Amino acid sequence: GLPRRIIKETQRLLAEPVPGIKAEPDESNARYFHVVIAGPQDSPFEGGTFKLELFLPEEYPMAAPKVRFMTKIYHPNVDKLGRICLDILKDKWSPALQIRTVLLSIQALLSAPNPDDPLANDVAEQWKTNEAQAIETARAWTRLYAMNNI
Amino acid sequence: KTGLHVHEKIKHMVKNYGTMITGIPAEILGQNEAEISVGYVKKMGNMKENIAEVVRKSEMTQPTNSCGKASNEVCDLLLGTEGASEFEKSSYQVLSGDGSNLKGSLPNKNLLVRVEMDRFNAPQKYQKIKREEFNPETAEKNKIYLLEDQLVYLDIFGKVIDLGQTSDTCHRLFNAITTPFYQNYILYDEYIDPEESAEEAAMFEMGEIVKAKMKNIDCWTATHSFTIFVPESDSEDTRTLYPYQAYWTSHTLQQWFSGDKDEKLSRLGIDGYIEKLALLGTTTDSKIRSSIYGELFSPPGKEHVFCTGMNEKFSPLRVKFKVTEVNPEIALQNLEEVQEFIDTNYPGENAKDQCELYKIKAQEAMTKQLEMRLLIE
Amino acid sequence: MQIFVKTLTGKTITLEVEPSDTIENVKAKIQDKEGIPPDQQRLIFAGKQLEDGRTLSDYNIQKESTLHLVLRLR
């Protein structure tokens, strides 16, 4: 009792995973996903493992999948609750986008922080005035919270 | 007083003075900002510091980044308010498949082009429903509704539009869709297979019906706006166009000029720039549509990441244009009055100091008004 | 019905609406008056951000109510 698009989208994520990203459905809820995204190299999150949770609302197909970081991360586009702006500019969420599109977005976001579009203002304050020390703080959080967490 | 001197004056003035180009006194920016920001001030403790915290966090003096606003004040400077008002009354022409009408609309004069590009906002969802339970004035709009004897579109204005299907066709489609989570679902699903079953064969057939019906149904929403300045050149191949824009939650026109994207895209040539503007509307591949979209309208430097991932352009685009004449003695006059306003009201030894004083004055007005709204409780 | 749309510069416009017009339509009506594509707009009422999909009667916009047109975001 669940649409086919979600099933093949699931299977194609286990069969053909995205490098650096693991996504498998929850044991009790086929619409809940437990995600692990590796910290991209040449980024302050290198060598880290980041736990996320991805939920497909009942209107997921026409709606935008809700995603939240579980691992604590020093990133100007993740608030203190772990929430990410699923930004779509001058357009809305269309069913032409998938789970994998979202997962690639978070991965790309970890490699390109956008302080001029903040979600953690105190963090983005540091990313603009003292980027070299914001990156220094992000690397410290990677060791504290994003190693041996999985 | 040249058309190229007009481009060089507005670009240099927008580059240095930002929002002060619009000629609004800083006192009204602070007053209006205080009106819309009063609720953000903490109610307890030192009200002087609570107000200060909000005034510091304000960006009222940062230039606009609504593209329509940028186009409006670009028109309001090169033509004047009366000339731009008269320019608004003219109608947009849809860019032909190869941009023929646009190239044929640019004689060797001082011309300003205004562009309004639209995205195709056709419905993506459908719903099975009975005529007894279908209220057009309440149900979700921009949506397809399959009733037992009629297939129908409910547009963005709540109007009910018949999709030309017989009652027998709708009866067969209505009864084939049985699964509960397919009752209210999406139209164009890549994962449904017609050979799978009769339900998905019907869901797919309905999708092909709706898709065919709406290539003659007007479902465009205005998505983007910008202007292009084409000065008179003494020869036919020295001609060059300068696109002017700002982008929603992206960049201002001041940043557009600082990164010199106007002159970067001018080096594409008139025929080359229009060709990319034409291929944007005729392509059907999202990767080519996004690539050109990123090349033409993305901030300086982000041409290759602006329309990737979540921001891939999956919707058909339509470019519309309107052209008018620019009198360089009008435009330079309109700009020198802005310089006059700036210098007499916000004097400084350079633009940096003149902008600081403008921001300062706007903050003191916002501070003084906020103090008056919050002293009474 | 009449609502006012005010901006940060003081420029105020009047729109002829119905209590059942959605936020997308009032945005399009601003596009009629100003030539600003609705994708370049944010409408605020009483501090709350007006969302696409909901109506004026939802946020309880009465006659002579003034909306704030924001023309700068992140």
TrEMBL record, chain B:
<feature type="domain" description="MvcA insertion">
    <location>
        <begin position="123"/>
        <end position="219"/>
    </location>
</feature>
<protein>
    <recommendedName>
        <fullName>MvcA insertion domain-containing protein</fullName>
    </recommendedName>
</protein>
